[PDB]
Amino acid sequence: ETPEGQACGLVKNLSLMSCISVGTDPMPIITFLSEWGMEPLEDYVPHQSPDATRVFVNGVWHGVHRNPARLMETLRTLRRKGDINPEVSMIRDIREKELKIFTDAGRVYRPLFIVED
């Protein structure tokens, strides 16, 4: 569903199940992150920890975390409870040493069935 010609591909339509994130406070997460072993960036030394996965949150580099998957689990599990807002988006880029969390409104998202082992 795009209108032909001039607006073509520029005017788009939400697939039935897209909603748009409403925008959530990242305070409690950033709070949880350093509670969960995120190293503060102030206290960060790379030649010392280059295996460090860097946690971003709404774009802000908040620091670092060795052993992210154990952060990632929790982050996922929290959101899957309700304790972190469902709309909150967390992407770990394993091969980039990055874990970017997103809480800002405007992110178009859709629902999926969780397949977990």
Q: Which stretch binds other proteins (CB under 8 A): 29-37, 41-49, 66-74, 76-84?
A: 41-49
Q: Should residue 94 be labelled a site residue for other proteins when binding is judged by CB under 8 A?
A: no
Strand ranges, E, within 41-95? 54-57, 60-61, 63-64, 89-93
Could you tell me which of 43, 39, 42 has the C-alpha nearest to residue 54? 39
Closest distance between other proteins and the C-beta of residue 91, in Å? 8
d(CA 38, CA 57): 12
# residues near other proteins by CB under 8 A: 27
Q: Is 42 in the site for other proteins (CB under 8 A)?
A: yes
Out of 17, 47, 115, 116, point to the residue binding other proteins (CB under 8 A): 47
Binding part of the chain for other proteins, among 4-12, 31-39, 68-76, 78-86 by CB under 8 A, reads 4-12
SS3 content of the chain, % helix, strand, coil (to 5): 25, 20, 55
